[PDB]
Structures are given as structure tokens and as C-alpha cells.
Design a protein around this ligand. Structure first.
Ligand SMILES: [Mn+2]
Ligand SMILES: [Mn+2]
Ligand code: NA
Length: 261
């Protein structure tokens, strides 16, 4: 799927909105706030201000507008009014918006209250793994290299990479081809071409890689109950690199990454 100059522009709009939801919610992510209220804030904003729609809601029956995962929760945490954030917590807020027919998908970690050493480190190393992978993207390279480089980096830090979930192609469809694994796999055989749009979203655990799913059909936790973090960005392969469509002001990497010169 090679997006056209116009479709790419739409992806920029959808990606920007997704990223802006994360920038907007930051001030609300504090101790004592419930994940349920954070969700309502994000939804009212997406609908009433961005004039877009959450792609998560209803997707395979997902009940909320955004996914919020805390500490040992790996992904797909469901916003709840009874779940309050507290100091030391590391929280992922996963956002997916649909606008003008195109999707914008992204997520980041938030450290609540006073940070713990492992909390700050895990999140930091996880973002560094995403950035390292991003700096690699450019026409010609094979997706298998990006996944191999992520796993290599993360494991040398003494952490592990989650296997059950992966990045994905994205466009008029929420999840399109190809699959973007965050570890080395002999199945990956894709040569990036300019115009391609997909996501990179590594999930990293402080302990072992195994993840156990809960009895609600969604919530995934680490088997050993160790902390797990994830960061996600949607990108578009440019002629000499890539462009991050969901870049935020707090990101410390440039929107456009060039390689030719
Ligand atoms: Mn995604
Ligand atoms: Mn996502
Ligand atoms: Na987590």
C-alpha cells in the first residue's frame, strides 16, 4: 500500500490528531485520577474538538475510546472509574483516531508522581528501542532488520521483548499489511518502499517475556508480574528515510529522518 501525496497528507492529519490527544491529556495524568475519567477526557476531545472518532471503540468489541495500561499490564488495559493512578505508576495511554478516512495510531508512557529507578529506566530504554528502530527506516531495508535490532538492544539491557503483539501497516484500515515484529523472525521479508505507512510499537518487560491474558477478554499482564512499557509511532517511508506522523513536542527525535546525504 503506497499512499499517494494526498493520502500521505491525510495520514499526517490523522497522526497529528492522535499525537495531540497524548499532549492534551498529559496534565491530567496525576495521582488520584481514574483511568475511566482520562478516557472520557480523551473521547470528548477527539469528538468535540478534533472532530474525529476513536478507532478503538467497538473494534472487536473494545469497550473504550483509548487503552490505558498500568505497571505490569502489558497492553489493552481498559479504562475504569475505580482504577486510580498512584505515585510510582508507569502508565501507557494508547490512542487511535480515524479522520478523513485515515488512521493515526500512537502511545507513550507517563510516569505518575515520584518516579522509581526501574520505572524511569524501563520507560527510557523502551523509547530508545523505538527511536533506534526509527533511525533505521528507509527505502531498501528489510523489516526483519528493524525487529532484530530492537530485540538485540533490549535484551542487552537485561529486559525482554513481548512476542504476542506487533506493529502493523496502517491506512484506511486500522491494521493492514505488513506485520512489524519487534524481534528477529525468519518470517519477516519486507523491503521498505517510499510511500509505505506503518507502526512500530515495542512492548518491553523488566522481567521475562511471557504474558498472561486476564479473564475479561482484553487485559494482558506479564506472567511474572514485572513492569512492562511500550511506545508507539506511526510513520511514512520517505525517499531517503522516514517521516514520523505522530511526533509530539516531548519527542526528542526529529520528525523527518534523512539518509541520502
Ligand atoms: Mn498500533
Ligand atoms: Mn496503538
Ligand atoms: Na505496563
Amino acid at each position: 500500500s503506497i499512499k499517494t501525496p494526498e493520502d500521505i497528507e491525510k495520514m499526517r492529519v490523522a497522526g497529528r490528531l492522535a499525537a495531540e490527544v497524548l499532549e492534551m491529556i498529559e496534565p491530567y495524568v496525576k495521582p488520584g485520577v481514574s483511568t475511566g475519567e482520562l478516557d472520557r477526557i480523551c473521547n470528548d476531545y477527539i469528538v468535540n474538538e478534533q472532530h474525529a472518532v476513536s478507532a478503538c471503540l467497538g473494534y472487536h468489541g473494545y469497550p473504550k475510546s483509548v487503552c490505558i495500561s498500568i505497571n505490569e499490564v502489558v497492553c489493552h488495559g481498559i479504562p475504569d472509574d475505580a482504577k486510580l493512578l498512584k505515585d510510582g505508576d508507569i502508565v501507557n495511554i494508547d490512542v487511535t483516531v480515524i479522520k478523513d478516512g485515515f488512521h493515526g495510531d500512537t502511545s507513550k508512557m507517563f510516569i505518575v508522581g515520584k518516579p522509581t529507578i526501574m520505572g524511569e529506566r524501563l520507560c527510557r530504554i523502551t523509547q530508545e528501542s523505538l527511536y533506534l528502530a526509527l533511525r533505521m527506516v528507509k527505502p531498501g531495508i528489510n523489516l526483519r532488520e528493524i525487529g532484530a535490532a530492537i530485540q538485540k538492544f533490549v535484551e542487552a539491557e537485561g529486559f525482554s521483548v513481548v512476542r504476542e503483539y506487533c506493529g502493523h501497516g496502517i491506512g484506511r484500515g486500522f491494521h493492514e499489511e505488513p506485520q512489524v515484529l519487534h524481534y528477529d523472525s525468519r518470517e519477516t521479508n519486507v523491503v521498505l518502499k517510499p510511500g509505505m505507512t506503518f507502526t512500530i510499537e515495542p512492548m518491553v518487560n523488566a522481567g521475562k517475556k511471557e504474558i498472561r491474558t486476564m479473564k475479561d477478554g482484553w487485559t494482558v499482564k506479564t506472567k511474572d508480574r514485572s513492569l512492562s512499557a511500550q511506545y508507539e509511532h506511526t510513520i511514512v517511508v520517505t525517499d531517503n528515510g522516514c517521516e514520523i506522523l505522530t511526533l509530539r513536542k516531548d519527542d526528542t527525535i526529529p520528525a523527518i529522518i534523512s539518509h541520502d546525504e
